[PDB]
Amino acid sequence: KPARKLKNAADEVAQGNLRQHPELEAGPQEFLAAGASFNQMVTALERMMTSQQRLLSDISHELRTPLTRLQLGTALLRRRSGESKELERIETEAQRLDSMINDLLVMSRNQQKNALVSETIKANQLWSEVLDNAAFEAEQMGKSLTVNFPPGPWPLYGNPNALESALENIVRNALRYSHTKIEVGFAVDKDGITITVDDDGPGVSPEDREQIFRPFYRTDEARDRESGGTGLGLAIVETAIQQHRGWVKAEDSPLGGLRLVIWLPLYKR
Amino acid sequence: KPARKLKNAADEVAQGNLRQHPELEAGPQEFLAAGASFNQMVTALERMMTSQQRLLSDISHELRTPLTRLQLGTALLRRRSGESKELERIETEAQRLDSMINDLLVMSRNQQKNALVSETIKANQLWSEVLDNAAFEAEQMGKSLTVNFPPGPWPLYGNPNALESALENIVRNALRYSHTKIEVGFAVDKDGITITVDDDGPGVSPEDREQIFRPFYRTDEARDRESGGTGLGLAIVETAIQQHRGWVKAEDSPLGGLRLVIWLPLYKR
Ligand SMILES: Nc1ncnc2c1ncn2[C@@H]1O[C@H](COP(=O)(O)OP(=O)(O)OP(=O)(O)O)[C@@H](O)[C@H]1O
Ligand SMILES: Nc1ncnc2c1ncn2[C@@H]1O[C@H](COP(=O)(O)OP(=O)(O)OP(=O)(O)O)[C@@H](O)[C@H]1O
């Protein structure tokens, strides 16, 4: 049917397959024009799409040119001097950045959803690497990172990097805006993992506790010692967890600062 | 008539009008499904369009954290071992990458706010405010701003702030790098508005005329004249216009400097 040709084409492009439909330009009916205009429209949308897509994948390669020189450099230090414990942390951060750039590349070219690359993963595997790197950062800023309860072989379903980043942020946010201590508490039950990250520093006014989770938004109070302050962090967190069927809340910490709590459901086979 | 609803909707979205068409969900005909699937498709295409923007703001944000751990690491190598010739290269690459990310974060902060509202707008309404403020800036730096032809009630469809900013930059770049005069020329035809911005100042070598539009690229010649910062300006411009179904080119100005030409299609309906 000519009505069915359009149903099928509109539902196909909606998936993300902006390929031409010659099917809609068949039959000299009143529909030839609705099909030729739809065919024009896919190339029009493709034209608009491959614009953000290219001058993304462009940003990608110019970020790669100084990383490659950094990676080239570290590798030459290793050959001259030894295998310093710090060379390893510089090395692995370059490796960590190299993947995030190839993520800026593959995810631009995809231009679709469901690309969530969701797998089965254990809580202990997921955030161990996170916590270790967080613990290191504390020593460097002379603050105390105490993890009251560690994560265990607790099952989860979703994007590892997405969840990794959710906590990575919560803890760094806690690390930054604290005074001297950060406490991370894992909790597990028949329904889900409950991460609670407490800080030493100043809290956030009860009214602003909801606002923080707004993208590109920072509290007026923290806006007077800003520096490396964007306002992105917690809005990313909120999404990652909410799309992982869980929730995130901001409370008043008994440590005197702010409490962030992430709840995530367990993966049940 | 149900065939005409689709002609009109497909030709409207093709122009960037990703707004919902309730018209296609009228009449309990065989077309209700082709219209409901088309309506689903616009929100699907809008979701894709916005995602590519969110992706960058997120990837740039998360790229900042392993750098910090790099930068933390290098700084600790310096304290343990010496000031290795290679450590300097690793150090300066991290510096360049961080500066890039810092302003890559600034760009996507604006782009999200610029790409907030999509709508029908007249060329005269859009860039008048821009040009007036540009004209004022010229008097203040003792330069001449002459607008050979003003914009008229010419129809356009897209983000006002996105397009506003595209020209705002082209003219300011023209203003900065000029010696004494800046000429802006509007032109309109049955197909589109053609803005041409000419500068008195030094031009750009024919080989570098393509390079300029690269993110972070700032010509070696005009890297000594101004302390600057990014090089994103023209790379942002290129995207804004390219995603607004138009193009941007850099030619040799008859004013002796550089001329930039922005072509944008008219909104028809
Ligand atoms: N642990 C914390 N203690 C106190 N205030 C906090 C804490 N975490 C977040 N905030 C407040 O929430 C605001 C917004 O947080 P958000 O994650 O959205 O952005 P950001 O941390 O400021 O910046 P970035 O995007 O670089 O992470 C901060 O500016 C700060 O005022
Ligand atoms: N009108 C112009 N005349 C001469 N050179 C120009 C002109 N506009 C741009 N350029 C050159 O192209 C480079 C890149 O353009 P771009 O718009 O990114 O400017 P920018 O100053 O580097 O960055 P931004 O405008 O964001 O501050 C400039 O650094 C300069 O060398």
Residue numbers in the entry:
A (entry chain B), B (entry chain A): 188 to 456
Task: Please give sentences taken from the publication describing this entry.
The polypeptide chains of the HAMP domain were fully traced into SAD-phased experimental electron density maps of the CpxAHDC orthorhombic and trigonal crystal forms. The domains are formed by two parallel helices (α1 and N-terminal part of α2) linked by a long connector, which despite a low sequence identity adopt a dimeric four-helix bundle similar to the Af1503 and VicK HAMP structures. In all homodimers, the fixed CA domain is sequestered by the DHp domain in an inactive kinase conformation, with the ATP-γP positioned far away from the phosphorylatable His248. Instead, the active site formed by the second, mobile CA domain is poised for catalysis in three independent structures crystallized in two distinct crystal forms (trigonal and hexagonal space groups), with the ATP γ-P and the acceptor His248 Nε atom well positioned for the phosphotransfer reaction to proceed. The catalytic cores (DHp + CA domains) are very similar to each other in the three independent crystal structures; they can be superimposed with r.m.s.d. of 0.9–1.4 Å and display an identical network of hydrogen bonding interactions involving key functional residues for ATP binding and catalysis. This highly conserved active site geometry in distinct crystalline environments emphasizes the stability of the CA–DHp interface in the Michaelis complex and lends further support to its functional relevance. In the Michaelis complex, the CA carrying the ATP molecule and the phosphorylatable His belong to different subunits of the homodimer, which structurally confirms trans-autophosphorylation for CpxA. The geometry of the active site points to Glu249, the amino acid adjacent to the phosphoacceptor His248 in the DHp domain, as a key functional residue. Its carboxylic side chain makes hydrogen-bonding interactions with both the Nδ atom of His248 and the carboxamide group of Asn356 from the CA domain.
Here we report crystal structures of the full cytoplasmic region of CpxA, a prototypical HK involved in Escherichia coli response to envelope stress. The sensor kinase CpxA senses a variety of envelope stresses, including misfolded proteins, and transduces this signal to the RR CpxR through conserved phosphotransfer reactions. The full cytoplasmic region of E. coli CpxA (CpxAHDC), encompassing the HAMP signaling domain (residues 188–237) and the DHp and CA domains of the catalytic core (residues 238–457), has been produced as recombinant protein for structural studies. The CpxAHDC structure consists of a homodimer, in which the HAMP and DHp domains from both subunits assemble into an elongated central coiled-coil region flanked on either side by the two CA domains.
